[PDB]
Design a protein around this motif. Structure first.
Motif, PDB file in Angstrom:
ATOM      1  N   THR A  32      47.136 -31.769  91.060  1.00 42.76           N
ATOM      2  CA  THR A  32      46.066 -30.915  91.560  1.00 42.76           C
ATOM      3  C   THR A  32      46.029 -29.606  90.775  1.00 42.76           C
ATOM      4  OG1 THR A  32      46.072 -31.881  93.789  1.00 42.76           O
ATOM      5  CG2 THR A  32      45.291 -29.701  93.663  1.00 42.76           C
ATOM      6  N   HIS A  33      44.919 -29.322  90.100  1.00 40.25           N
ATOM      7  CA  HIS A  33      44.642 -28.051  89.427  1.00 40.25           C
ATOM      8  C   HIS A  33      43.442 -27.380  90.079  1.00 40.25           C
ATOM      9  CE1 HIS A  33      47.298 -28.544  85.822  1.00 40.25           C
ATOM     10  NE2 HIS A  33      47.193 -29.811  86.241  1.00 40.25           N
ATOM     11  N   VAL A  34      43.592 -26.135  90.521  1.00 40.46           N
ATOM     12  CA  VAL A  34      42.517 -25.353  91.145  1.00 40.46           C
ATOM     13  C   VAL A  34      42.389 -23.983  90.468  1.00 40.46           C
ATOM     14  CG1 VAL A  34      41.480 -24.601  93.331  1.00 40.46           C
ATOM     15  CG2 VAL A  34      42.889 -26.626  93.323  1.00 40.46           C
ATOM     16  N   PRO A  35      41.702 -23.881  89.317  1.00 44.53           N
ATOM     17  CA  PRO A  35      41.234 -22.608  88.770  1.00 44.53           C
ATOM     18  C   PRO A  35      40.028 -22.029  89.517  1.00 44.53           C
ATOM     19  CG  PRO A  35      40.506 -24.394  87.313  1.00 44.53           C
ATOM     20  CD  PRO A  35      41.325 -24.986  88.451  1.00 44.53           C
ATOM     21  N   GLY A  36      39.348 -22.831  90.337  1.00 40.10           N
ATOM     22  CA  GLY A  36      38.196 -22.436  91.145  1.00 40.10           C
ATOM     23  C   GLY A  36      38.581 -21.980  92.547  1.00 40.10           C
ATOM     24  N   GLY A  37      37.698 -22.189  93.515  1.00 35.77           N
ATOM     25  CA  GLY A  37      37.995 -21.937  94.926  1.00 35.77           C
ATOM     26  C   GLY A  37      38.162 -20.466  95.314  1.00 35.77           C
ATOM     27  N   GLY A  38      37.736 -19.511  94.490  1.00 31.75           N
ATOM     28  CA  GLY A  38      37.671 -18.107  94.907  1.00 31.75           C
ATOM     29  C   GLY A  38      36.501 -17.832  95.854  1.00 31.75           C
ATOM     30  N   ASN A  39      36.600 -16.797  96.683  1.00 30.48           N
ATOM     31  CA  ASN A  39      35.468 -16.258  97.436  1.00 30.48           C
ATOM     32  C   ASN A  39      35.312 -14.776  97.089  1.00 30.48           C
ATOM     33  OD1 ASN A  39      36.680 -18.382  99.894  1.00 30.48           O
ATOM     34  ND2 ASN A  39      34.538 -18.477  99.433  1.00 30.48           N
ATOM     35  N   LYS A  40      34.101 -14.310  96.796  1.00 20.97           N
ATOM     36  CA  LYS A  40      33.843 -12.874  96.673  1.00 20.97           C
ATOM     37  C   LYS A  40      32.502 -12.472  97.238  1.00 20.97           C
ATOM     38  CE  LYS A  40      32.472 -13.164  91.738  1.00 20.97           C
ATOM     39  NZ  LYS A  40      33.148 -14.366  91.190  1.00 20.97           N
ATOM     40  N   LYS A  41      32.458 -11.343  97.945  1.00 20.59           N
ATOM     41  CA  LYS A  41      31.221 -10.619  98.242  1.00 20.59           C
ATOM     42  C   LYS A  41      31.154  -9.196  97.722  1.00 20.59           C
ATOM     43  CE  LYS A  41      27.795 -13.477  99.167  1.00 20.59           C
ATOM     44  NZ  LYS A  41      27.379 -13.838 100.542  1.00 20.59           N
ATOM     45  N   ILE A  42      30.002  -8.870  97.154  1.00 17.11           N
ATOM     46  CA  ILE A  42      29.615  -7.539  96.699  1.00 17.11           C
ATOM     47  C   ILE A  42      28.506  -7.083  97.651  1.00 17.11           C
ATOM     48  CG2 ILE A  42      28.635  -6.211  94.805  1.00 17.11           C
ATOM     49  CD1 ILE A  42      29.833  -8.516  92.925  1.00 17.11           C
ATOM     50  N   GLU A  43      28.676  -5.954  98.329  1.00 13.68           N
ATOM     51  CA  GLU A  43      27.721  -5.461  99.322  1.00 13.68           C
ATOM     52  C   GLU A  43      27.456  -3.959  99.200  1.00 13.68           C
ATOM     53  OE1 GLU A  43      27.492  -7.456 103.126  1.00 13.68           O
ATOM     54  OE2 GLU A  43      27.531  -5.532 104.169  1.00 13.68           O
ATOM     55  N   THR A  44      26.194  -3.555  99.276  1.00 10.60           N
ATOM     56  CA  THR A  44      25.764  -2.171  99.055  1.00 10.60           C
ATOM     57  C   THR A  44      24.917  -1.676 100.215  1.00 10.60           C
ATOM     58  OG1 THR A  44      25.811  -2.424  96.658  1.00 10.60           O
ATOM     59  CG2 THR A  44      24.541  -0.622  97.446  1.00 10.60           C
ATOM     60  N   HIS A  45      25.228  -0.476 100.680  1.00 10.07           N
ATOM     61  CA  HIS A  45      24.540   0.243 101.737  1.00 10.07           C
ATOM     62  C   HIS A  45      24.125   1.614 101.220  1.00 10.07           C
ATOM     63  CE1 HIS A  45      25.704  -2.674 104.852  1.00 10.07           C
ATOM     64  NE2 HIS A  45      26.795  -2.812 104.091  1.00 10.07           N
ATOM     65  N   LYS A  46      22.852   1.986 101.370  1.00 10.17           N
ATOM     66  CA  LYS A  46      22.400   3.359 101.130  1.00 10.17           C
ATOM     67  C   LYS A  46      21.385   3.812 102.167  1.00 10.17           C
ATOM     68  CE  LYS A  46      21.069   2.589  96.825  1.00 10.17           C
ATOM     69  NZ  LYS A  46      20.409   2.638  95.495  1.00 10.17           N
ATOM     70  N   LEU A  47      21.466   5.076 102.562  1.00  8.97           N
ATOM     71  CA  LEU A  47      20.506   5.730 103.449  1.00  8.97           C
ATOM     72  C   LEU A  47      20.173   7.108 102.867  1.00  8.97           C
ATOM     73  CD1 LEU A  47      21.099   6.157 107.298  1.00  8.97           C
ATOM     74  CD2 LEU A  47      19.369   7.259 105.979  1.00  8.97           C
ATOM     75  N   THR A  48      18.895   7.385 102.603  1.00  8.47           N
ATOM     76  CA  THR A  48      18.435   8.680 102.080  1.00  8.47           C
ATOM     77  C   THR A  48      17.371   9.339 102.958  1.00  8.47           C
ATOM     78  OG1 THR A  48      16.728   7.906 100.513  1.00  8.47           O
ATOM     79  CG2 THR A  48      18.934   7.852  99.687  1.00  8.47           C
ATOM     80  N   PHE A  49      17.613  10.568 103.412  1.00  8.46           N
ATOM     81  CA  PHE A  49      16.547  11.531 103.705  1.00  8.46           C
ATOM     82  C   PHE A  49      16.051  12.268 102.469  1.00  8.46           C
ATOM     83  CE2 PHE A  49      17.199  10.612 108.050  1.00  8.46           C
ATOM     84  CZ  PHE A  49      16.072  11.101 108.725  1.00  8.46           C
ATOM     85  N   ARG A  50      14.774  12.648 102.533  1.00 10.05           N
ATOM     86  CA  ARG A  50      14.093  13.613 101.660  1.00 10.05           C
ATOM     87  C   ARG A  50      13.163  14.512 102.484  1.00 10.05           C
ATOM     88  NH1 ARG A  50      12.567  10.499  95.816  1.00 10.05           N
ATOM     89  NH2 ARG A  50      14.594   9.660  95.511  1.00 10.05           N
TER      90      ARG A  50
END
Lengths: 72, 72, 72, 72, 72, 72
Positions: free
Chosen positions: A54-72
């Protein structure tokens, strides 16, 4: 203003060999007879083996998440 | 302004060999007879092996998350 | 302003060989007979082995998380 | 019986970069300006380099030769 | 019976970077200006380099030779 | 029987960087200006280097030679 999005998702990956049954697989007879025989170059040989490799170079999990709130 | 987003997601990865059954796998007979025999170069040999070999360079988890709030 | 974002997500990776059953694995017969036989270069040999070999250069966990708040 | 075979062969291999001329190659102008800038993940960077990088896993030579003479 | 085989062969290998000419290579102008700048993960950086980097895991020589003479 | 085989072969390997000419290599101008700048993880940096780096794990010589003579 109410900003209330929800992520409730169920996400799965199930990859490779899963839930298999091997019943008495190597039960027979293997005979190898070699006589007066010559190799000039690299040899890989398997006789009568039943490895789990069994070889597993795969099987990673990743999330990239962005939050922004601006008043002007 | 009420910024209240939610992540409740369930994420899984299950990769390689999972939940397999091997019953009496190497139960048979292996015979190797070698005579008057010559190798000039590198040899790898397995006879009658049942190795479990597992390589996991993968299977990493990562989160990148960014928050910003500006008044002006 | 209320800024109350939430991460409640459950994240798992389970990679390699997991939950397998090996019942009486090496139960048979292995015979290797070698006579008048010659190697000029490197040999790797396994006869009748059942090694459990596990390499995990993977399987890491990381968070990168950034927060900023600006008045002007 | 006279058995007098002769090998007079000339064999050459010439691989990679051979006999190139590079005249004033990096003679121009390189300007890099970077401001208010962020990396979440791994960086490799080259600015204005002129390396010679040479890798040789090849370029071995081998001969295998066998002589046998039999009376009966 | 006269058994007088001859090897007079010339065998050569020349691999990598050979006989190149580099005349005033890094002769121009390289400018890097970096400000208010952030790295969360590993950095490799070259600015204005002219290395010779040479790796030789190859380039071996080997002879294997076998002689046998049988009267019966 | 006269058994007089001869090896007169000339065998050479020349691998890596050989016979290159580097004339005034680093002769130009390299400027690096860095301000308010941050690393959370491992850094490798070269500015204006001209290294000769040589690795030779290869380059071995070997003879394997076998002689046998049988009367019956």
């Amino acid at each position: 203003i109410v900003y209330k999005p929800v992520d409730l998702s169920k996400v799965t990956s199930k990859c490779g060999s899963l839930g298999n049954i091997h019943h008495k697989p190597g039960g027979g007879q293997v005979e190898v007879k070699s006589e007066k025989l010559d190799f000039k170059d690299r040899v890989q040989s398997k006789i009568g083996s039943l490895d789990n490799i069994t070889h597993v170079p795969g099987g990673g999990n990743k999330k990239i998440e962005t939050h922004k709130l601006t008043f002007r």
